[PDB]
């Protein structure tokens, strides 16, 4: 299977209440493994998955050094964005950054990411060719022109194609029993009349990993897209995920409905019926 590593960082300015809060978290696929919080007392990159704890002290020192440098950099970038957008120093603003890589089944590089959002909207993003940028607006174009002239993109390629791929490969082997597992959903159905002529059928997927899943209701073999109530996949809290899909059905007609579950952990997709 293909795999990904991501780091997600958030800087939030809080004028009059000190310096911006910086939080960064690291993920392999759907599993978090590290975090950094500028407000926390330790000022260390800290483990959040058991298989990363076996990294020696040079790892924790170096990763701490890197993430703290990023926190300083994005602090300054908050101030530059403030000037580019002609915004007052009174308000609270947010700079988000994501970076990482995807690898294929064979562990080889597929994609690298290096991208920012300011106040919740695209700012600048490294494009697929790893040579050019997509800027969202006129303020981001200033940065884009600066970074093109300085060849920022080229200077990130060693990390994206090398360090990131290599690290992801190491984590996937060290966390093999966790990260390469595939837990199929445990499924069931619930049925609740809502009047004397209608009833809810709810199809449940529980305990699955990875989070990617598809739950669809059909009636007499036809997809019920517009009438299905479908909640966002949600964490159980133990490292697995949950989802359900409900349809409101005329009573006595429950047998026309089927819920179809596709998950990478199922040899064949499931068809459930009440």
């Amino acid at each position: 299977g293909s795999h990904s590593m991501r780091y997600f960082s958030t800087s939030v300015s809080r004028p009059g209440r000190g310096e911006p809060r910086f939080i960064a978290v690291g993920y392999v696929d759907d599993t978090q493994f590290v975090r950094f919080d500028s407000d926390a007392a330790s000022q260390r990159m800290e483990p959040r998955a058991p298989w990363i704890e076996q990294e020696g002290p040079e790892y924790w020192d170096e990763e701490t050094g890197k993430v703290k440098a990023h926190s300083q950099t994005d602090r300054e970038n908050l101030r530059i964005a403030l000037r580019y957008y002609n915004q007052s120093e009174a308000g609270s603003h947010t700079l988000q950054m994501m970076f990482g890589c995807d690898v294929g089944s064979d562990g080889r590089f597929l994609r690298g990411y290096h991208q920012y959002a300011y106040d919740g909207k695209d700012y600048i993003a490294l494009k697929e060719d790893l040579r050019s940028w997509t800027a969202a607006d006129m303020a981001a174009q200033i940065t884009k022109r600066k970074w093109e002239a300085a060849h920022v993109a080229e200077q990130q390629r060693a990390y994206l194609e090398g360090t990131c791929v290599d690290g992801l490969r190491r984590y996937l082997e060290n966390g093999k029993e966790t990260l390469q597992r595939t837990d199929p959903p445990k499924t069931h159905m619930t049925h609740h009349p809502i009047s004397d002529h209608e009833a809810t059928l709810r199809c449940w997927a529980l305990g699955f990993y990875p989070a990617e899943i598809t739950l669809t209701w059909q009636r007499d073999g036809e997809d019920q897209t517009q009438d299905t109530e479908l909640v966002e996949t949600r964490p159980a809290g133990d490292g697995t995920f949950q989802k359900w899909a409900a349809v409101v059905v005329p009573s006595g007609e429950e047998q026309r409905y089927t819920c179809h579950v596709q998950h990478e952990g199922l040899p064949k997709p499931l068809t459930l019926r009440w």
Partner: peptide, 9 residues
Amino acid sequence: NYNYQYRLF
């Protein structure tokens, strides 16, 4: 593995 980030907007 984190990356080094030093570039300014």
